[PDB]
Design a protein around this nucleic acid. Structure first.
Ligand SMILES: [K+]
Ligand SMILES: [Mg+2]
Ligand SMILES: [Mg+2]
Ligand SMILES: [Mg+2]
Ligand SMILES: [Mg+2]
Ligand SMILES: [Mg+2]
Ligand SMILES: [Mg+2]
Ligand SMILES: [Mg+2]
Ligand SMILES: [Mg+2]
Ligand SMILES: [Mg+2]
Ligand SMILES: [Mg+2]
Ligand SMILES: [Mg+2]
Ligand SMILES: [Mg+2]
Ligand SMILES: [Mg+2]
Ligand SMILES: [Mg+2]
Ligand SMILES: [Mg+2]
Ligand SMILES: [Mg+2]
Ligand SMILES: [Mg+2]
Ligand SMILES: [Mg+2]
Ligand SMILES: [Mg+2]
Ligand SMILES: [Mg+2]
Ligand SMILES: [Mg+2]
Ligand SMILES: [Mg+2]
Ligand SMILES: [Mg+2]
Ligand SMILES: [Mg+2]
Ligand SMILES: [Mg+2]
Ligand SMILES: [Mg+2]
Ligand SMILES: [Mg+2]
Ligand SMILES: [Mg+2]
Ligand SMILES: [Mg+2]
Ligand SMILES: [Mg+2]
Ligand SMILES: [Mg+2]
Ligand SMILES: [Mg+2]
Ligand SMILES: [Mg+2]
Ligand SMILES: [Mg+2]
Ligand SMILES: [Mg+2]
Ligand SMILES: [Mg+2]
Ligand SMILES: [Mg+2]
Ligand SMILES: [Mg+2]
Ligand SMILES: [Mg+2]
Ligand SMILES: [Mg+2]
Ligand SMILES: [Mg+2]
Ligand SMILES: [Mg+2]
Ligand SMILES: [Mg+2]
Ligand SMILES: [Mg+2]
Ligand SMILES: [Mg+2]
Ligand SMILES: [Mg+2]
Ligand SMILES: [Mg+2]
Ligand SMILES: [Mg+2]
Ligand SMILES: [Mg+2]
Ligand SMILES: [Mg+2]
Ligand SMILES: [Mg+2]
Ligand SMILES: [Mg+2]
Ligand SMILES: [Mg+2]
Ligand SMILES: [Mg+2]
Ligand SMILES: [Mg+2]
Ligand SMILES: [Mg+2]
Ligand SMILES: [Mg+2]
Ligand SMILES: [Mg+2]
Ligand SMILES: [Mg+2]
Ligand SMILES: [Mg+2]
Ligand SMILES: [Mg+2]
Ligand SMILES: [Mg+2]
Ligand SMILES: [Mg+2]
Ligand SMILES: [Mg+2]
Ligand SMILES: [Mg+2]
Ligand SMILES: [Mg+2]
Ligand SMILES: [Mg+2]
Ligand SMILES: [Mg+2]
Ligand SMILES: [Mg+2]
Ligand SMILES: [Mg+2]
Ligand SMILES: [Mg+2]
Ligand SMILES: [Mg+2]
Ligand SMILES: [Mg+2]
Ligand SMILES: [Mg+2]
Ligand SMILES: [Mg+2]
Ligand SMILES: [Mg+2]
Ligand SMILES: [Mg+2]
Ligand SMILES: [Mg+2]
Ligand SMILES: [Mg+2]
Ligand SMILES: [Mg+2]
Ligand SMILES: [Mg+2]
Ligand SMILES: [Mg+2]
Ligand SMILES: [Mg+2]
Ligand SMILES: [Mg+2]
Ligand SMILES: [Mg+2]
Ligand SMILES: [Mg+2]
Ligand SMILES: [Mg+2]
Ligand SMILES: [Mg+2]
Ligand SMILES: [Mg+2]
Ligand SMILES: [Mg+2]
Ligand SMILES: [Mg+2]
Ligand SMILES: [Mg+2]
Ligand SMILES: [Mg+2]
Ligand SMILES: [Mg+2]
Ligand SMILES: [Mg+2]
Ligand SMILES: [Mg+2]
Ligand SMILES: [Mg+2]
Ligand SMILES: [Mg+2]
Ligand SMILES: [Mg+2]
Ligand SMILES: [Mg+2]
Ligand SMILES: [Mg+2]
Ligand SMILES: [Mg+2]
Ligand SMILES: [Mg+2]
Ligand SMILES: [Mg+2]
Ligand SMILES: [Mg+2]
Ligand SMILES: [Mg+2]
Ligand SMILES: [Mg+2]
Ligand SMILES: [Mg+2]
Ligand SMILES: [Mg+2]
Ligand SMILES: [Mg+2]
Ligand SMILES: [Mg+2]
Ligand SMILES: [Mg+2]
Ligand SMILES: [Mg+2]
Ligand SMILES: [Mg+2]
Ligand SMILES: [Mg+2]
Ligand SMILES: [Mg+2]
Ligand SMILES: [Mg+2]
Ligand SMILES: [Mg+2]
Ligand SMILES: [Mg+2]
Ligand SMILES: [Mg+2]
Ligand SMILES: [Mg+2]
Ligand SMILES: [Mg+2]
Ligand SMILES: [Mg+2]
Ligand SMILES: [Mg+2]
Ligand SMILES: [Mg+2]
Ligand SMILES: [Mg+2]
Ligand SMILES: [Mg+2]
Ligand SMILES: [Mg+2]
Ligand SMILES: [Mg+2]
Ligand SMILES: [Mg+2]
Ligand SMILES: [Mg+2]
Ligand SMILES: [Mg+2]
Ligand SMILES: [Mg+2]
Ligand SMILES: [Mg+2]
Ligand SMILES: [Mg+2]
Ligand SMILES: [Mg+2]
Ligand SMILES: [Mg+2]
Ligand SMILES: [Mg+2]
Ligand SMILES: [Mg+2]
Ligand SMILES: [Mg+2]
Ligand SMILES: [Mg+2]
Ligand SMILES: [Mg+2]
Ligand SMILES: [Mg+2]
Ligand SMILES: [Mg+2]
Ligand SMILES: [Mg+2]
Ligand SMILES: [Mg+2]
Ligand SMILES: [Mg+2]
Ligand SMILES: [Mg+2]
Ligand SMILES: [Mg+2]
Ligand SMILES: [Mg+2]
Ligand SMILES: [Mg+2]
Ligand SMILES: [Mg+2]
Ligand SMILES: [Mg+2]
Ligand SMILES: [Mg+2]
Ligand SMILES: [Mg+2]
Ligand SMILES: [Mg+2]
Ligand SMILES: [Mg+2]
Ligand SMILES: [Mg+2]
Ligand SMILES: [Mg+2]
Ligand SMILES: [Mg+2]
Ligand SMILES: [Mg+2]
Ligand SMILES: [Mg+2]
Ligand SMILES: [Mg+2]
Ligand SMILES: [Mg+2]
Ligand SMILES: [Mg+2]
Ligand SMILES: [Mg+2]
Ligand SMILES: [Mg+2]
Ligand SMILES: [Mg+2]
Ligand SMILES: [Mg+2]
Ligand SMILES: [Mg+2]
Ligand SMILES: [Mg+2]
Ligand SMILES: [Mg+2]
Ligand SMILES: [Mg+2]
Ligand SMILES: [Mg+2]
Ligand SMILES: [Mg+2]
Ligand SMILES: [Mg+2]
Lengths: 122, 249
RNA sequence: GGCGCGUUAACAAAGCGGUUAUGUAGCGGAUUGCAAAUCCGUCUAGUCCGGUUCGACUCCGGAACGCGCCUCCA
RNA sequence: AAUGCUAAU
RNA sequence: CCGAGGGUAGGGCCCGUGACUGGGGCGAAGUCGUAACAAGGUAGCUGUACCGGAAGGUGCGGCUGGAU
RNA sequence: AGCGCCGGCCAACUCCGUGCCAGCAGCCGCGGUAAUACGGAGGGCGCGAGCGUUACCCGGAUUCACUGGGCGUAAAGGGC
RNA sequence: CGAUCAACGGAUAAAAGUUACCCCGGGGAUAACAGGCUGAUCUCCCCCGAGCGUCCACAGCGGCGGGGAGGUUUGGCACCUCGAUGUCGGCUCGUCGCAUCCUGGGGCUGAAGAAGGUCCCAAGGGUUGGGCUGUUCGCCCAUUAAAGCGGCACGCGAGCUG
RNA sequence: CCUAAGGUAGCGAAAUUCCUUGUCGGGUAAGUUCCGACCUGCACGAAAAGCGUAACGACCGGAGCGCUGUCUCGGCGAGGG
RNA sequence: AAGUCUGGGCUAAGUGGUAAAGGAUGUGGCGCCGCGAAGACAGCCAGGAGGUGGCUUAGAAGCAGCCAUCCUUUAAAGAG
């Protein structure tokens, strides 16, 4: 459950550390973004000489949420933070590495390269 | 176009008071040459030197086909002689600059109300029940440019709409008068340049009674006649190389 | 918009019902190696329109333009 | 009393 | 216990960069004057102080690297 | 068999073209219609499977001076 | 005889301002809000067909003029209300109009397709979140099928805010 | 030309700037506010003082961190009504 | 409350029962010339041509813009 103003950690090596959500790219007026949903964000914190820099308006797909995700088999998964991988307009990651686990939901939603690069898929 | 009336701007280049003196030599040359060609001449801006010269002289050439002929004299003109301001009989290489321009129209500027949007709205600040409920404040937008003017100086939407439109025009006018200045400026520097001794277009060497035009490889020796108006030789010689230039391909 | 003031020659700026304003420039001459400073001379005028009068830059009315002040209680 | 003199052995 | 390093917070030094701003060097021509070199036409220079478009001027003291 | 060079330093000069242009340049300087200084040519000088250029080091620099310098007026005696 | 007693039937021989510290008596005989009448202003729609549009008046346009509709704006008027008709914006809650922003259905196209333009039908539903400012309005960011324009005492303060 | 004399230093889109949300820079994804500049200062200015100033302020702006039912967006519960 | 009264005519729009320029094979009625069995109007069958373009144009050649629009096989064919 990610909305405008929500801060997310950045689980890639683009140089972004913290993005702040400014739009849930889901239809006309989606209130929240969950795993697999693309958001638009501004880069609030970054590290020197990275691809992205503090102030860019980037896209990103949510990979980890602190609100538990529910699943048809009746289970649920919960992560310790809100995380996102910064992507390009063709939905591909822009870094070359994904840090930490990611939700298996990303698979069923077209983010294989992210699911591939992630160390664990839960 | 070559058929328009033209405006010649002669400025003094490197050479101090002798540059201004030679500037006058160019000045009488063009006036006389023009009269022999039929064209009328009226001076508009003159800046004389008490030694007889001109820091700058601007005059128009009024006659069908002035920019056709005079356009070839735009550039730096080099003199070499013993100046009347020199005492040790030395030859000084001085210069003048001549700019030639097509006489501009004037073109009255008027608002096209079809590319203008006018917003009305409540004003700001004092006025009690009036200011609360009156659409006295006016915005005016020039839709292509986007520049706007707002006004709530009076309590009347009409007096305010009038003062806002007047300002929108005055502002658009200045923007239009300024892009032209840039054009008039970049064009002059395409002709006059820095005014240095180099960049010369045509040398007038008095000791050897020679007048050379370095663009075409033409020189005459009728210097007294050149500096008096009989320029038609060099112009035709220039026009020739211009027509020989237009050879494709 | 209302009220007041103005528009003079190259510029700045006055008087005046009939008439060389003036300053500086500009023009002719002198002086100076030359330029200035200086000296001797000299000169260009009243925004438009309509009135009054023998006669209007001058007086009356209007127009255009510029300046000044005011436009408040809601 | 009284200012100035550019720049090419 | 120590411990690579990661995180947090506050300092120190350095480099690049910045609307704008301050002067500096340079230029075969411009504008205003003419402060200095002749007793440079008010001897100059000087520390300081005040003032001035500018060179500078003036006050106080100093020096001769000053003329006749 | 080539490369550099031929105003002075510095060894090696004349003709044409150019006309403060084109260009030369390490310094001083060449070139604005009679250029050994630009470009080409003939000739010349120097080296020669090399010849030049650039960068840097030491030298010339007794121009950081120990060898081997200075401070009245040239930079330089500290206000006492 | 002495009047620019010129406010010219002439209040004293003799006289200016200020009040947001204000007060009383009155008036909807008279202004500011809203309504009403009107519709110059405003918004929308037509008539004419000069001209544009390579060609071609009318795909898209429409010189000079002409006729209207509406009752959102600015005005005119002073008709109920001055023994009170609480006034901006916001919030909340809606409801209506249609000159329709989107979605549905169309004709023409200077409509190949995709995407537009333009006009016609259509009011069922829908018509986002943010930065600035008290703002309305407007600009901007990120989206969207779209980010519609108006009426309801510029809807709504015995509902809140201030 | 006029005046009694024509605003000096400093400061300046300001508790002052109408045009105005001036223009440029900064901060923000986006800044009519804010901060730094510029200066055609509608309509600063030197004891109705001018320009600064450490400390101080239940004064008035702007920004960040922290944290939150202020909000998305409301839910439940307690007691007094 | 009093005529579903009488006679003639118009309207088909619920016009009547809210509006303008202007547009229109709505309907009825007056006119005025015009063409017709010298076979009219409509449809249909043909001829609808030729020298072929004239300034302009690479073609604009009947079919952009400019110039006037000659004539014959003729019953008539336009350089349209
Ligand atoms: K008051
Ligand atoms: Mg990270
Ligand atoms: Mg970076
Ligand atoms: Mg940052
Ligand atoms: Mg930053
Ligand atoms: Mg990535
Ligand atoms: Mg991580
Ligand atoms: Mg000049
Ligand atoms: Mg001399
Ligand atoms: Mg409009
Ligand atoms: Mg108002
Ligand atoms: Mg305000
Ligand atoms: Mg007030
Ligand atoms: Mg009102
Ligand atoms: Mg006068
Ligand atoms: Mg005058
Ligand atoms: Mg006078
Ligand atoms: Mg007088
Ligand atoms: Mg007279
Ligand atoms: Mg006289
Ligand atoms: Mg005179
Ligand atoms: Mg004279
Ligand atoms: Mg003289
Ligand atoms: Mg008259
Ligand atoms: Mg008269
Ligand atoms: Mg007059
Ligand atoms: Mg008059
Ligand atoms: Mg008052
Ligand atoms: Mg003097
Ligand atoms: Mg001088
Ligand atoms: Mg000088
Ligand atoms: Mg000299
Ligand atoms: Mg440790
Ligand atoms: Mg550590
Ligand atoms: Mg670690
Ligand atoms: Mg630095
Ligand atoms: Mg001097
Ligand atoms: Mg002196
Ligand atoms: Mg002298
Ligand atoms: Mg002197
Ligand atoms: Mg002196
Ligand atoms: Mg003396
Ligand atoms: Mg002194
Ligand atoms: Mg003094
Ligand atoms: Mg050599
Ligand atoms: Mg050698
Ligand atoms: Mg030798
Ligand atoms: Mg060489
Ligand atoms: Mg020459
Ligand atoms: Mg020669
Ligand atoms: Mg020579
Ligand atoms: Mg030679
Ligand atoms: Mg050499
Ligand atoms: Mg040579
Ligand atoms: Mg060395
Ligand atoms: Mg040594
Ligand atoms: Mg040394
Ligand atoms: Mg020693
Ligand atoms: Mg020594
Ligand atoms: Mg001593
Ligand atoms: Mg009186
Ligand atoms: Mg009276
Ligand atoms: Mg009285
Ligand atoms: Mg009477
Ligand atoms: Mg009396
Ligand atoms: Mg009395
Ligand atoms: Mg009285
Ligand atoms: Mg009183
Ligand atoms: Mg009162
Ligand atoms: Mg008060
Ligand atoms: Mg008060
Ligand atoms: Mg009180
Ligand atoms: Mg009280
Ligand atoms: Mg009282
Ligand atoms: Mg009262
Ligand atoms: Mg009362
Ligand atoms: Mg009362
Ligand atoms: Mg009464
Ligand atoms: Mg009334
Ligand atoms: Mg009355
Ligand atoms: Mg009223
Ligand atoms: Mg009222
Ligand atoms: Mg009222
Ligand atoms: Mg009113
Ligand atoms: Mg009301
Ligand atoms: Mg009213
Ligand atoms: Mg009412
Ligand atoms: Mg109307
Ligand atoms: Mg009406
Ligand atoms: Mg109208
Ligand atoms: Mg209509
Ligand atoms: Mg039509
Ligand atoms: Mg056409
Ligand atoms: Mg067509
Ligand atoms: Mg029109
Ligand atoms: Mg009308
Ligand atoms: Mg109407
Ligand atoms: Mg109308
Ligand atoms: Mg109208
Ligand atoms: Mg109404
Ligand atoms: Mg109304
Ligand atoms: Mg009114
Ligand atoms: Mg009204
Ligand atoms: Mg009445
Ligand atoms: Mg009332
Ligand atoms: Mg009562
Ligand atoms: Mg009552
Ligand atoms: Mg009451
Ligand atoms: Mg009541
Ligand atoms: Mg409709
Ligand atoms: Mg549709
Ligand atoms: Mg459709
Ligand atoms: Mg369509
Ligand atoms: Mg299509
Ligand atoms: Mg249609
Ligand atoms: Mg609908
Ligand atoms: Mg807001
Ligand atoms: Mg904020
Ligand atoms: Mg707003
Ligand atoms: Mg506004
Ligand atoms: Mg769509
Ligand atoms: Mg859109
Ligand atoms: Mg919005
Ligand atoms: Mg509504
Ligand atoms: Mg209301
Ligand atoms: Mg409303
Ligand atoms: Mg209300
Ligand atoms: Mg109520
Ligand atoms: Mg209330
Ligand atoms: Mg309210
Ligand atoms: Mg109430
Ligand atoms: Mg109520
Ligand atoms: Mg009530
Ligand atoms: Mg308040
Ligand atoms: Mg309050
Ligand atoms: Mg002042
Ligand atoms: Mg002073
Ligand atoms: Mg002072
Ligand atoms: Mg100042
Ligand atoms: Mg300012
Ligand atoms: Mg500002
Ligand atoms: Mg300030
Ligand atoms: Mg002020
Ligand atoms: Mg302002
Ligand atoms: Mg303001
Ligand atoms: Mg802005
Ligand atoms: Mg910025
Ligand atoms: Mg930052
Ligand atoms: Mg800004
Ligand atoms: Mg704020
Ligand atoms: Mg500031
Ligand atoms: Mg300014
Ligand atoms: Mg003050
Ligand atoms: Mg005072
Ligand atoms: Mg004060
Ligand atoms: Mg005072
Ligand atoms: Mg104070
Ligand atoms: Mg202060
Ligand atoms: Mg201090
Ligand atoms: Mg302080
Ligand atoms: Mg302080
Ligand atoms: Mg305090
Ligand atoms: Mg306090
Ligand atoms: Mg206290
Ligand atoms: Mg914050
Ligand atoms: Mg905060
Ligand atoms: Mg915070
Ligand atoms: Mg709550
Ligand atoms: Mg409860
Ligand atoms: Mg309870
Ligand atoms: Mg019957
Ligand atoms: Mg009968
Ligand atoms: Mg009908
Ligand atoms: Mg009906
Ligand atoms: Mg009807
Ligand atoms: Mg009709
Ligand atoms: Mg009829």
């Amino acid at each position: 459950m990610i909305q405008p103003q929500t801060y997310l950690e950045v689980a890639d090596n683009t140089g972004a550390r913290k993005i702040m959500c400014i739009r849930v790219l889901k239809g006309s007026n989606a209130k929240y973004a969950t795993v697999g949903d693309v958001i638009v964000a501004s880069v609030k914190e970054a590290i020197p000489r990275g691809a992205v820099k503090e102030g860019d308006v980037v896209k990103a797909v949510v990979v980890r949420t602190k609100k538990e995700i529910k699943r048809p088999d009746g289970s649920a998964i919960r992560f310790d933070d809100n995380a996102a991988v910064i992507i390009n307009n063709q939905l591909e990651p822009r870094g070359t590495r994904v840090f930490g686990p990611v939700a298996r939901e990303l698979r069923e939603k077209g983010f294989m390269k992210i699911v591939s690069l992630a160390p664990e898929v839960l | 176009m070559d058929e328009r009336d033209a405006i010649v701007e002669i400025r003094a280049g490197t050479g101090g008071e002798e540059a201004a003196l030679f500037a006058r030599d160019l000045f009488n040359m063009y006036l006389r040459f023009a009269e022999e060609m039929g064209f009328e001449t009226e001076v508009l801006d003159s800046h004389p030197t008490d030694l007889g010269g001109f820091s700058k002289v601007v005059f128009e050439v009024r006659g069908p086909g002035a920019y056709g002929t005079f356009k070839y004299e735009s550039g730096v003109h080099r003199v070499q002689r013993v100046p009347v301001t020199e005492t040790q009989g030395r030859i000084h290489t001085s210069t003048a600059t001549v700019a030639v321009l097509p006489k501009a129209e004037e073109e009255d500027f008027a608002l096209n109300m079809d590319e203008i949007r006018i917003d009305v709205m409540r004003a700001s600040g004092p006025g009690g029940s009036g200011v609360n409920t009156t659409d006295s404040a006016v915005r005016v937008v020039h839709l292509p440019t986007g520049i706007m003017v707002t006004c709530q100086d009076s309590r009347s939407q009409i007096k305010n709409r009038e003062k806002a439109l007047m300002i929108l025009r005055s502002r658009l006018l200045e923007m239009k008068r300024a892009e032209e200045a840039e054009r008039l400026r970049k064009t002059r520097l395409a002709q006059i340049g820095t005014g240095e001794r180099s960049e010369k277009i045509r040398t007038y060497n008095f000791p050897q009674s020679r007048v050379t035009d370095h663009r075409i490889g033409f020189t005459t020796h009728d210097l007294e006649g050149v500096l008096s108006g009989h320029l038609t030789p060099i112009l035709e010689a220039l026009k020739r190389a211009d027509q020989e230039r237009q050879l494709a391909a």
